[PDB]
Amino acid sequence: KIFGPTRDWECYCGKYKRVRFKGIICERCGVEVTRAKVRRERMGHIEL
Amino acid sequence: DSEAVVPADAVSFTLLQEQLHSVLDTLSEREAGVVSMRFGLTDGQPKTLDEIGKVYGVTRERIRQIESKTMSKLRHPSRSQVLRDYL
Amino acid sequence: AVTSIRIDGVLHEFTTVPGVKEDVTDLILNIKQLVVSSEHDEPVVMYLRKQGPGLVTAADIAPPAGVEVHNPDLVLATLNGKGKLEMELTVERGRGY
Amino acid sequence: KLHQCGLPKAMALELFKPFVMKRLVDLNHAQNIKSAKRMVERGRTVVYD
Amino acid sequence: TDAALAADLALPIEELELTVRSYNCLKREGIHSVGELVARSEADLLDIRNFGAKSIDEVKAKLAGMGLALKDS
Amino acid sequence: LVQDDVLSSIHIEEHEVDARDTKLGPEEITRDIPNVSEEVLADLDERGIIRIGAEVVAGDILVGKVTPKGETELTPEERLLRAIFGEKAREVRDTSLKVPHGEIGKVIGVRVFDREEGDELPPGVNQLVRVYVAQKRKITDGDKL
Amino acid sequence: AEEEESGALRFGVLGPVRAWRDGETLATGSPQQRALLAALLLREGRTATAGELIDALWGEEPPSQALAAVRTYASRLRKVLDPGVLVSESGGYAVRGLAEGALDLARAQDLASAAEKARSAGDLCHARDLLRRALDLWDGEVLAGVPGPYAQTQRVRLGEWRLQLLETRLDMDLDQGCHAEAVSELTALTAAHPLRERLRELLMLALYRSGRQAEALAVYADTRRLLADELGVDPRPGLQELQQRILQADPALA
Amino acid sequence: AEEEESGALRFGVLGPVRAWRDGETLATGSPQQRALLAALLLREGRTATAGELIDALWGEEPPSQALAAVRTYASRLRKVLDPGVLVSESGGYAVRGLAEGALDLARAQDLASAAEKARSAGDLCHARDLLRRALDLWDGEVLAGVPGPYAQTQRVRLGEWRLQLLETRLDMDLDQGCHAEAVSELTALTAAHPLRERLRELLMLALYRSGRQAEALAVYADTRRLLADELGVDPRPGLQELQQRILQADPALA
Amino acid sequence: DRGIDLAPRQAVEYACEKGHRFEMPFSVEAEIPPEWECKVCGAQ
Amino acid sequence: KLHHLVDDKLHARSTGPYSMITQQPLGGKAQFGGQRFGEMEVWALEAYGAAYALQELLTIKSDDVTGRVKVYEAIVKGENIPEPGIPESFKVLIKEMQSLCLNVEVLSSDGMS
Ligand SMILES: [Zn+2]
């Protein structure tokens, strides 16, 4: 959800496997459908 | 890493796309049109034989007959070496 | 000179024949020293067969017509009591190496 | 000469492989790129030429 | 006119559009091109087995339709 | 020193592969390698083992192991190509053991271990195969004396 | 008449397509549903789908409502025939309940196989009797009044199958020495069908075994001039060998 | 009939979708249900995940919430088949308990391998019997009435395999000395499929020694005309070569 | 990525108790949930 | 006859396996790797003044994921070599520094990036 999907254009809950509706947010799990290389550039944070 | 893109694979994919467009242009215009929609080659969505029977206006019998004729024509060994190695 | 061989019971040159005191590669080395003459343009297959204890020599080979061994005293292998050696030597006519 | 070096066949094939496939398709020894790669991996004499 | 004669010689025997008898007779001997028949002299096709005068007349009318002639004719 | 076999040596190179039951399923050693010509698999046995004494080259097949499943996201172009040619119904990936580049030799010995037999194996794996390839390297350019 | 079992449903496709029930014909009706029934009958019990049946029977151009037409044809067949014979399977239709020997096609294949086995075993009389009883199952022209390209294809297939059955019966009758009817039937076949030259080769064998020589050479000249005029290719080496064996008076053939 | 043991559950994919439970039928059900059972049958007993089966039934656009649909299809299979013949692992579905001869496809590969082994050994009678048993396996069109482009893929694959199997059958029939049923089958198949070059080469080979030359080259000319009209190219060089050696009439291959 | 038409997207505004407002897209066919997290502070 | 043989010392690369943590090609004879282009190599190429050769050895032929595939495509198709991008290892450096609470931002002449 935070860093990005591990496959290409897939989401965590197993739905939205198709490439056509890219750039949308899944309702079940919130994972943006996009490339797997975005996990090389997306960071989060820890609140202390 | 298995997720790393292989340049040979991408070159093979784009050449497969170009050669598929070329062999589609090789066939007749109407046959190219009907095959472009059966597997939805033109767009991201394939279409059924009843779905294309309204815009073009033919029976299920005739549309599946010309479809199977296109598959048989592409199944001929002449138009195979351009695609057999492409798997 | 001999350019190809075949031994019954042997699938590659790195194994050993059951019943000879040295391995197959040493037999390859001994075959290379065997000098022959052949007037046939086509490859000619000789035959080598020896059974029982003894010492197989180049004279024990069986050459066809138009092929003869010229150094029959050359040692090839040594057979014990359980030695099986059937060998089809091919000779070809050529020059150089 | 002063400006020459001698590469082996395998080295020059693996270094210049994409150029070899491009020229093979240009010289139509193979029908397409995949067949050119197949010949290069197989290593026929036309590839060396 | 070099391109025209090259195209005429390069056409196969299927474009002749004539009877099966003469086509089978010429393909039996191994002839598969119009220029191959052109290079043949009169005695080359007058010695063909089961090749009557009707086949020769039909072939002559055919080539006359395409406008060319035989060798030394 | 080349024609008299003076300076030459036997070089036996060992490299193995094993079959394991992963999450998708267990890979098997077999004969029916997908999407390959029959001539490539001409020197295999029934259980997927290269014959003892089979001459091998770079890129050749030694033992035929098929990956039980890979992720299937077929493009419409590949879908219609599969419809044209017809593809085998089990979806398998060609991850069988092949000879590395620039290596030649004779298969001089094969060793097969099975989980179903009494032989011990590491956890997870089911079949383990070892293939020895031997070449008689002669002296040539670049050898160090 | 000895196999006329009570309650057995029999069908015939070697001639006009008809339905027989206990020796009584059934109202087949339209020739088009007859074509559909023959399409299901010619498979020797093998099933089919509706789509392939329509594509094979109705050519490239079916009308806009072919599915309702084939459905009502099959429904009419369901009234006229037994309900259990015609069954629905995955949207397709098939003929079931066919007993052994009821269909003329399956009986013809079985008798041909039995004749081949008897010929391999040396029983020539049993083989010729079996394939003469099988040849009596043909009711003239195959598929009378049956339209469609499929009808033409199986018409040609059954015609050449009958012709080759007659050819093998003819050659083993020549081997049996009964040339009197064989010569007349060979002449009738050559007059009817000038295309299958194995029949003329059997005619050469019959003429050589009969005794006359000059007429055989006249027939050879006629065959040669026809294969020169309409074909023009050289004669087969087997035909030339047979001709030179006839000319050399080989006592082995006589 | 000799392999009908007690407790045997026979499955069939080469013909339509059916189940034989010691001689009595089982209702395989919906066309999508038939496709699901066939897709489990083609995989010789994988645990195949739910998404893969969903793709196999429908392809690119399966309805979104139809995972429970495939669940209730699995329930249908479990209540119409044995409770233990179908077992689920990690959400995947798997049919086990399939003995030898239970699947006609496994028997088909077994018969093909046995025929290949007999051809390697040079035997003819046993190989002919094996392929005679193999040609009795298919019943009509394969995978009758099942949706899914996946099903189309194994349909065309099994059809092509059947084409090469009949090519081998006709080839050994020609080489062993069978011509009449050979030319009958070749004519029937070229009537069914007009654009196969290999079967027309087989036509040329069969008619070349059975006593038929004019219609063979007529069919060849028709093939050339259709191939020029639909493809506009030249046929394979092996064909022209086969027609060439035919023309000089070599008796070497007699 | 050539010739592919993206799904239509709608803008739905989410507001938290701390007053943070952010815009993120939803698919037209996708159901709109009234419950979501905050991009700034993670509040409801 | 030493064991430093020539039949195994030969090793060449066109496009093989790549490292995971950074997108440079990996190394090793058995793994189809690429020869390391060390620091003194870069010093020598600076000394020649050959900016383009050094720049492409550092960007085009390694660690540019949008560059290697495009260059392979351009070579096979026959067109000219495309312009290089930014090596992925520098982006790894930026992401590493940005996680040590160092506000590392790249700004161009007009503005930020
Ligand atoms: Zn999701």
Author numbering:
A (entry chain D): 50 to 97
B (entry chain F): 424 to 510
C (entry chain A): 50 to 146
D (entry chain D): 437 to 485
E (entry chain K): 239 to 311
F (entry chain C): 727 to 871
G (entry chain J), H (entry chain I): 17 to 270
I (entry chain G): 19 to 62
Copied sentences from the primary study:
Streptomyces antibiotic regulatory proteins (SARPs) are widely distributed activators of antibiotic biosynthesis. Streptomyces coelicolor AfsR is an SARP regulator with an additional nucleotide-binding oligomerization domain (NOD) and a tetratricopeptide repeat (TPR) domain. AfsR null mutants show defects in afsS transcription, as well as production deficiencies in actinorhodin and undecylprodigiosin. It is presumed that upon binding of AfsR to a 22-base pair (bp) binding box (afs box), RNA polymerase (RNAP) holoenzyme is recruited to the afsS promoter, allowing for transcriptional initiation. We find AfsR uses its SARP domain to engage the afs box and make extensive interactions with all RNAP subunits except ω subunit.
Notably, when assessing the transcription activation of full-length AfsR and ΔTPR, we observed that they exhibited lower levels compared to the isolated SARP domain, indicating that the NOD and TPR domains exert an inhibitory effect on the transcription activation of the SARP domain. Preincubating dephosphorylated AfsR with ATP or GTP significantly enhances its transcription activation. Besides, the activation of AfsR was likely triggered by ATP binding rather than ATP hydrolysis, as evidenced by the comparable effect of preincubation with a non-hydrolyzable ATP analogue, ATPγS. The MS results revealed phosphorylation at T337, the last residue of the Walker-A motif of the nucleotide-binding domain (NBD). We tried to find out the interplay between SARP and its C-terminal domains during transcription activation by assembling AfsR-TIC. AfsRT337A was used to eliminate the interference of E. coli endogenous kinases and ATPγS was used to active AfsR. The final cryo-EM map was refined into a nominal resolution of 3.63 Å. But the density extending from the C-terminal of SARP was very ambiguous and could not be improved by 3D classification and local refinement, presumably due to the high flexibility of the NOD and TPR domains relative to the SARP domain. The structures of SARP and RNAP in the AfsR-TIC resemble those in SARP-TIC, indicating that the SARP domain in the full-length AfsR and the isolated SARP activates transcription by similar mechanism.
